[PDB]
């Protein structure tokens, strides 16, 4: 039993929730609240510890973009602050290479970043790495065979179908084939040698379509669409299945959790979250 963690998110205001879903029995565990509320963050796990990165606290008394990095120990159920990023990054994308957390893009006010920076937990230090070729907020990130992919998002003016890939040895970004659909606020993950982009927002609608990128062919292909259109969703991969969590669908905040099985090319509903929300950080032990 590994768990699916969902941290923060939004419903009326940014949230402090940390909850864990157990797909074996379909129960949600209610864990130690985040120290500061935030939505538009991203989650990742390094060395057994859950990290919540960036986002923004949209509250009734204000909203403040976050440069925060905080670390959760599931064994102690305690959150600990880490050194912060060089800049606040709301609607950030994160991926892990070689035990290091890569913070990609995101916004600070009107500033849409192309910059990228890397945290080394052994030293509690962030350093800038090569920036992307495009400013991206609401960007989806996933890592496959130590290549990090930044997919879609919004550059301040237009939503994007473009994507690009980070090569760590050379510290260089290179463009990859663009997706078939413009997607900002998609869920992005990796499963069986493909990079998936699910849902998002194209400038006109919230989306239910899903497509994947085969690294071998350099082609994006559509797979089965989700039941519910959704943007600013959480996403993870657990035991060969993609889980999508919450999101906004143009009218309400979703509590639905759908699960994609690649063998059958079908989505099904699984135990929904304890409340509807968007902009969650998600990761899996």
């Amino acid at each position, epitope marked *: 039993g590994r768990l699916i963690y969902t941290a923060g998110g939004y419903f009326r205001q940014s949230l402090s929730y940390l909850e864990a879903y157990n797909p074996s029995d379909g129960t949600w565990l209610d864990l130690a609240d985040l120290q500061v509320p935030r*939505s538009g963050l991203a989650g990742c796990v390094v060395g057994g510890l859950l990290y919540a990165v960036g986002g923004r606290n949209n509250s009734p008394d204000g*909203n403040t973009d976050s440069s925060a990095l905080d670390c959760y120990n599931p064994m102690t159920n305690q959150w600990s602050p880490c050194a912060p990023m060089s800049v606040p990054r709301n609607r950030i994308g994160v991926g892990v290479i070689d035990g290091h957390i890569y913070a990609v893009g995101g916004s600070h006010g009107c500033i849409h970043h192309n910059s990228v920076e890397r945290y080394e937990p052994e030293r509690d230090e962030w350093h800038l790495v090569a920036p992307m070729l495009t400013r991206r907020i609401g960007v989806g990130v996933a890592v496959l065979n130590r290549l990090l992919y930044a997919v879609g998002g919004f550059d301040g003016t237009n939503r994007l179908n473009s994507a690009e890939c980070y090569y760590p040895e050379r510290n260089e970004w290179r463009m990859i084939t663009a997706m078939n659909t413009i997607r900002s606020g998609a869920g992005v993950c990796v499963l069986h040698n493909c990079i998936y982009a699910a849902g998002g927002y194209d400038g006109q609608d*919230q989306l239910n379509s899903v497509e994947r990128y085969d690294v071998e062919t350099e082609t994006w292909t559509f797979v089965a669409p989700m039941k519910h259109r959704r943007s*600013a969703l959480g996403i993870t991969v657990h035991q060969g299945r993609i889980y999508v969590l919450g999101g906004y*669908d*143009g009218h309400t*905040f979703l509590d639905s959790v759908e699960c994609y099985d690649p063998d059958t090319d079908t989505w099904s509903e699984v135990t929904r979250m304890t409340s509807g929300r968007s902009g969650v950080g998600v990761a899996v032990t």
Partner: single-chain antibody
Amino acid sequence: QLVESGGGLVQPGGSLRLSCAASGFAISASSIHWVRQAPGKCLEWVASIDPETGETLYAKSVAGRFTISADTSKNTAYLQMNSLRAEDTAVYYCARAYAGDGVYYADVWGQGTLVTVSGSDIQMTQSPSSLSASVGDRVTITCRASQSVSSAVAWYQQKPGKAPKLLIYSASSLYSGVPSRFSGSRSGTDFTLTISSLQPEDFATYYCQQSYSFPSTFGCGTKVEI
């Protein structure tokens, strides 16, 4: 087009729901903002919704009393206004908000609806408050931001009883449909709107807005008079 409705005359402590119905486009194809204007007063920004995340922002004066929402199936946005107070009295406008290099400007506005109920913000200082001119004049209007707003300034033209129209965004970019006689520049915190040669249809009130920092704020206008 946006057509508003849902206001009217009410008592303090009441509740109204304003409606903002879209025609010819989807209510989801942008941010939706509400802006209000008290009788003979300065524009005040009220609320916004981001259609990608669902997140709402509210002016401090209305937080926790007003709720902004979108309904995609009815193609109508709403502003639920609870615990109304006298100072809520105003013409309320809905508008689609256009992202220009990370900054939001309102490019399509509703006709406005009347609601009668009976600080650390960036100031944008507009002078003169009124200017008399003849057709053919070169006209210059100034707006000083109380602190740096980078280039996140827009200029709007408003004719009496009608919705503002976006002329310029990002300080100096002309919006489509705006004649080339209008131009805008920045010099630090001072923003100027120039009309090279005033035309009969140019007599109007002109307002500046900043959308650098929360909450967006407007100047109190310059009325260009015959």
